[PDB]
Amino acid sequence: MTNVADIEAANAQYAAAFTKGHLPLPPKRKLAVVTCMDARIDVFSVLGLTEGDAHVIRNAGGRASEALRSLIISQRLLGTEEVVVIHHTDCGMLTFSDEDIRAKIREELGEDASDIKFLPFRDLEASVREDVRFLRGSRLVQGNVTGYVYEVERGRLVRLDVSD
Amino acid sequence: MTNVADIEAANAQYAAAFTKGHLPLPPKRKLAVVTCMDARIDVFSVLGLTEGDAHVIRNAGGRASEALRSLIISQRLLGTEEVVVIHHTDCGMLTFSDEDIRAKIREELGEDASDIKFLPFRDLEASVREDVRFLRGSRLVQGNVTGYVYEVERGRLVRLDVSD
Ligand SMILES: [Zn+2]
Ligand SMILES: [Zn+2]
């Protein structure tokens, strides 16, 4: 109850103590992060970023196909040179198919979403390899791509070896 | 100049102090936030969120059209009931046309991107109004939508009144 009132109250405390007003547009680490919208992940705390360090791109499952527009802008307009892709344990995108979510939209809203692809995946590590390989194969992405699993159970980032 | 070594070292410190392993999938505030990938914005600090409070969806310019997949999953599978859309001052998406970025891709990569739409906007407040009205008009989004501008120069969230 009162989300808008609470975030505006918290913001007033943040703004009172804020001195980071001079930070420039290009990220200092020339880095873009692609990860899940998952509420339990604070990317800045997990990776030790401060304001101005890295682009942080977030979507349901941290899918690289959807991140690509954001990555091209990140690199071509704002100078980033590197991408990290982070999926996580206990991701919602493991727990349904396109058919299951289309059914839930019909059941709850009475709407047809048969032509929208929701990009769920069947295996966590396979999803990271598919995404990293996708970005390595793109002619529109420059630089090294690294894949990780974040363990929501212990706060650990686990780097994955992705062959090819 | 060793991004992967730096974030792995910082993560090892974060994991040593980590207590939050029992948090569940559904966000506690039943809230999804849509904002820019901009490096200077730590959404958790700006809004006073803790791990497990709100979904955080981020893309170049915080465009609601691209967030829609993520919002539908957030609401239908993970129980969120409300959306906040935050654009920001000094956003890169104000500073180019699709034809300007297509030129940079030709100059730097020697690639043609004439079939990709990058979704820049011409006016910051109009961009927030368009994105809020887009989500309010969608038959696949339930609940209240609020628009904000985040002022990168002063750390201030400014709520916009958006009609019809
Ligand atoms: Zn997830
Ligand atoms: Zn921006």
Instruction: For chain B, give every domain's residue range.
Output: 1-164
Q: What are the φ/ψ torsions at residue A69 (nearest 5 degrees)?
A: -55, -50
**What residues pair up with B82 in beta bridges, in sequence order?**
B31
Distances (CA, A) of B112 to A21, A55, A137: 37, 24, 16
Q: Which residue has the tokens 């994991």?
A: B15
Contacts of B109 in chain A (CB under 8 A): 76, 139-140, 142
Resolution (A): 1.8
Contact (CB, 8 A) for A26 and A78? yes
Say whether residue A97 is in contact with chain B using an 8 A CB cutoff: no
Among B121, B141, B123, smallest CA distance to B132 is for B141
- Say which of A10, A51, A111 has its CB closest to residue B47: A10
Contact (CB, 8 A) for B7 and A157? yes
Please give the Cα distance from B35 to B153 (Å, whole number): 17
Q: Are strands A145-151 and A156-160 parallel, antiparallel or unpaired?
A: antiparallel
Among B62, B102, B68, smallest CA distance to A55 is for B62
Q: Distance, in angstroms, between B86 CA and closest chain A CA? A: 12
Terminus-to-terminus CA distance in chain A, angstroms? Answer: 49
- Say which of A78, A109, A156 has its CB closest to residue B11: A156
Q: Could you tell me where the DSSP H helices lie in B17-159?
A: 43-47, 64-76, 98-109, 124-137
Experimental method: X-ray
Contact (CB, 8 A) for B82 and B143? yes
CATH 3.40.462.20 fits B1-164, yes or no: no
